[PDB]
Amino acid sequence: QAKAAPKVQVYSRHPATAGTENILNCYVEGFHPPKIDIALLKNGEPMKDVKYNDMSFGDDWTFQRLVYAPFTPTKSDVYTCRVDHEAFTEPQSFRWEPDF
């Protein structure tokens, strides 16, 4: 197979405010084959209530997926998106920058 490695962006639906409910987004694109594991983590633990939009692909055949979950960010909590794909040599973690 033509193995292509995902690129990842992690971002919030709205500009974030500590203590205010929001939605955490992890967008993963550019991967091939389609088999993939994408996890949203709060302090290293899988978050509750994670949703997944429809896998699509682009005209270089690589796939794209939005993963998203409600969250209420604080100053102390660390949110990451962890991506486990066979184009990587180990699972790759991507930290949400709060930008409060």
């Binding site: 197979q1 639906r13 939005l66 930008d99």
Partner: protein, 271 residues
């Protein structure tokens, strides 16, 4: 006034979590509107305006086309594994096709096939012919173009049937597709050493096209600006960021400029 209808088919020999054996997703202007996979074996709406305008026989009609194509793509996976002399394992057969209706009412057609992540057959608009990527693909090119009528039936579909569908679809979705939503913009400072990084983030805008740039005393700083790709939110709006590194004592000179269909004049935003 640009419009598009697109279908994306993905068939795998090796289903996995979140990857059914066969998935067919339809899109109008880049937004999913119908979904089918081999696990449910039904076509579901993905936006309200298609569920409200289509009766049961539409959903039955597209469903049996997807079920039949599912069946054909399972045969394709066996055919292509043998043709390329591969071992059983991980294999992916993909098709993307559809039509565009442009500003000036001219139309465009897309018809392209992939196997195991690589070009297989690509329709070339100027040659009016599928481009085979390799000797394996040439066999199918011959089947479609010379030994039967399939290439001509696809041509007709792309140039006629696809357009007729696109016209119907835009008229049922006109309110959702031509809506406007304004970005919430924030400029943030990111951590760095002896250098001040400014990050401009635009949240929740629709439609997708956007210009986000950094100005210094009114002058674009394209050379020094890095910008991420536009990415979706869960509600069908979009998101983008742009950063610039600046001299700490120049902080007051920089504004993020956002030009968007939702904004009467381009917005300027400051740290």
């Amino acid at each position: 006034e640009p419009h598009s209808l697109r279908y994306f088919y993905t068939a795998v020999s090796d289903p996995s979590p979140g990857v059914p054996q066969y998935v067919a997703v339809g899109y109008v202007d880049g937004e999913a509107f119908t979904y089918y996979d081999s696990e449910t074996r039904r076509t579901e709406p993905r936006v309200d305006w298609i569920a409200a305008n289509m009766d049961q026989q539409y959903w039955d009609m597209v469903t049996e086309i997807f079920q039949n194509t599912e069946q054909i793509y399972r045969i394709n996976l066996d055919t292509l594994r043998e043709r390329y002399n591969q071992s059983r394992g991980s294999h992916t057969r993909q098709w993307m096709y559809g039509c565009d209706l442009l500003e000036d009412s001219s139309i465009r057609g897309f018809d392209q096939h992939g196997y195991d992540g690589k070009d297989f057959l690509t329709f070339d608009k100027d040659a009016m012919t599928y481009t085979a990527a390799d000797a394996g693909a040439q066999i199918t090119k011959r089947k479609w173009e010379q030994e039967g009528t399939f290439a001509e039936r696809m041509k007709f579909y792309l140039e006629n049937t696809c357009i007729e569908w696109l016209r119907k679809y835009v008229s049922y979705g006109k309110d959702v597709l031509e809506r406007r939503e304004r970005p919430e913009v924030r400029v943030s400072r990111m951590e760095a050493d002896k250098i001040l990084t400014l990050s401009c983030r635009a949240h929740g805008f629709y439609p997708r096209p956007i210009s986000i740039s950094w100005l210094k005393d009114g002058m674009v700083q394209e050379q020094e600006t890095q910008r991420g790709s536009t990415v979706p939110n869960s509600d069908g709006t979009y998101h983008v960021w742009a950063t610039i590194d600046v001299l700490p004592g120049d902080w007051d000179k920089y504004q993020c400029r956002v030009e968007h269909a939702s904004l009467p004049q381009p917005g300027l935003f400051s740290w």
